[PDB]
From a paper:
We further mutated rsGCaMPs to increase brightness. The reason for the almost sixfold increase in brightness of rsGCaMP1.2 and rsGCaMP1.3 compared to [name] is apparent from their crystal structures, which show a I71H-enhanced water network and a direct effect of V107T in stabilization of the ON-state chromophore. This increase in ON-state stability alters the switching kinetics only slightly. For rsGCaMP1.2 we also elucidated the structure in the photo-switched state, which confirms the HT finding from rsGCaMP1.1.
Here we constructed the prototype of a photo-switchable Ca2+ sensor based on GCaMP5G that can be switched with 405/488-nm light and describe its molecular mechanisms at the structural level, including the importance of the interaction of the core barrel structure of the fluorescent protein with the Ca2+ receptor moiety. We engineered a prototype rsGEI based on the conventional Ca2+ indicator GCaMP5G28 by coupling cis/trans photo-isomerization, which underlies the photo-switching, to Ca2+ binding. These sensors show photo-switching only when bound to the molecule of interest.
Author numbering: 38 to 144, 159 to 222, 226 to 450
Write the structure that this text describes.
Amino acid sequence: DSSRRKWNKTGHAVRAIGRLSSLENVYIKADKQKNGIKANFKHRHNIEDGGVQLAYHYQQNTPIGDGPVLLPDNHYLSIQSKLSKDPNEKRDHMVLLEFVTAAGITLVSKGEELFTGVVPILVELDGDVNGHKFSVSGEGEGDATYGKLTLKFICTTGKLPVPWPTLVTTLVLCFSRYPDHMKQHDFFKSAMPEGYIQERTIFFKDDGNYKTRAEVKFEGDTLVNRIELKGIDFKEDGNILGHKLEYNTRDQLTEEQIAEFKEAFSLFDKDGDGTITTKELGTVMRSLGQNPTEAELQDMINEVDADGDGTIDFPEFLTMMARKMKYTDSEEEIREAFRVFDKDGNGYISAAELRHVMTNLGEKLTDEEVDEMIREADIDGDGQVNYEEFVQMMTA
Ligand SMILES: [Ca+2]
Ligand SMILES: [Ca+2]
Ligand SMILES: [Ca+2]
Ligand SMILES: [Ca+2]
Ligand SMILES: [Ca+2]
């Protein structure tokens, strides 16, 4: 509870740099050739018994009508999803709560007027994955003022043959909250009421892919999303057809954990003003042996900068860190963190390697306290920290 403390804070600072170096959002760009947009993003699915299944999405949107649309400057959407079960529902089902917000641009079409209140939604999907066919129906509502969606889905053909989480992205970005300074970048609402075509290819790493085509348009008062999905090349006992994905990634976010995050926060926020600047982030990254440019520091901040002020405020930090504990890191990401300590790449963090990190981070730590830290993590007693020991110390 003091060697452990030194691991938690140092670990969380390396984790924060790993988040700030990653691309977790939905990246939107103009596609003038199709009078629409393109998007790309990496989605994480936690594997129930440990690890993560990545799903790489490519996306295109094209207007159904000929009316004028808004072609955006580059920006991203930040999406938080919560999946649950209706305790009264006997059918194979998913309850989905989503918040969708536009950001990434530092400090109103006629279609936007259709979204000022609560709008009912209907969703219909026909799928075929490796010849396993299915249908999904969904219903609920969207409130774009807040970016909020509540949807319940039923598998109307009986048993869903893929995990529910793998259909979330497929099963209405017209409900995004765009801030006042980004209204001209909201392609989705500008296409309404006639609507847009949304097409994706979704590559499940080390597995098969989904292809999707959807029509998103008003049908009277209701926003309808009608989809066809085709999956190919899935492995019979991979994560998808094997049902090895976690359903419900719980927001179980303790007070001990927030406090840990604040200790790592304050390692960056060295003037104690409650925000991290580019100068502050760069100081810590240099001390860890990295050498980012000003432009890279600005792009790292912009990835988690919800208010567009160019700094990571305390609450923006707590949000980014919560999400980093909710979804599992890839092997590549955990090795990268490991390498910050394992300087010589021999697979073992030595007392000398850890002393070097700790005293570069400005923590004054004796011979004796360094040994205490190794001892805290050193399961097999060899006096070093190997990869699997590092993983144990890093996990909650
Ligand atoms: Ca500061
Ligand atoms: Ca900010
Ligand atoms: Ca602020
Ligand atoms: Ca080493
Ligand atoms: Ca060891």
